[PDB]
Write a protein that binds this ligand. Structure first.
Ligand SMILES: CCc1c(-c2csc(N3CCN(CC4CCN(CC)CC4)CC3)n2)[nH]c(C)c1C(C)=O
Length: 102
């Protein structure tokens, strides 16, 4: 039951218009400084893989990874940058969709 909702949230985040920065892991060879700054990278396809394996024991673990995506986003990108702007839309989407399930 706790896993069923995450399947919905993740499917909705995957297809959201503002999801394009977060569908695959950041390629640190292409982003000067990323590895130095972001110690725990996270993205939607990693969460999708972990969910497929069943590696989420609880609903809160899924939420921790989701928040980590947007913490990393706000750590590295300016709020007015094109990736920052998308991260805020996705972050607000996740929080508001999380709260109508829990
Ligand atoms: C600033 C760099 C950064 C990004 C970023 C910048 S551009 C981009 N991608 C990701 C993948 N995407 C795949 C294509 C190919 C397939 N499709 C074609 C139909 C369209 C999309 C291409 C654009 N990701 N994301 C994050 C979290 C960042 C940081 C530093 O936090």
């Amino acid at each position: 039951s706790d896993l069923t909702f995450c399947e919905i949230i993740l499917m909705e985040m995957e297809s959201h218009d503002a999801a394009w920065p977060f569908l695959e892991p950041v390629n640190p060879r292409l982003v000067s400084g990323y590895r130095r700054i972001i110690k725990n990278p996270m993205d939607f396809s990693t969460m999708r893989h972990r969910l497929s394996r069943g590696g989420y024991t609880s609903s809160e673990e899924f939420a921790a990874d989701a928040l980590l995506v947007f913490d990393n986003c706000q750590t590295f990108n300016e709020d007015d940058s094109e990736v920052g702007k998308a991260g805020h839309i996705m972050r607000r989407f996740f929080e508001s969709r999380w709260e109508e399930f829990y």
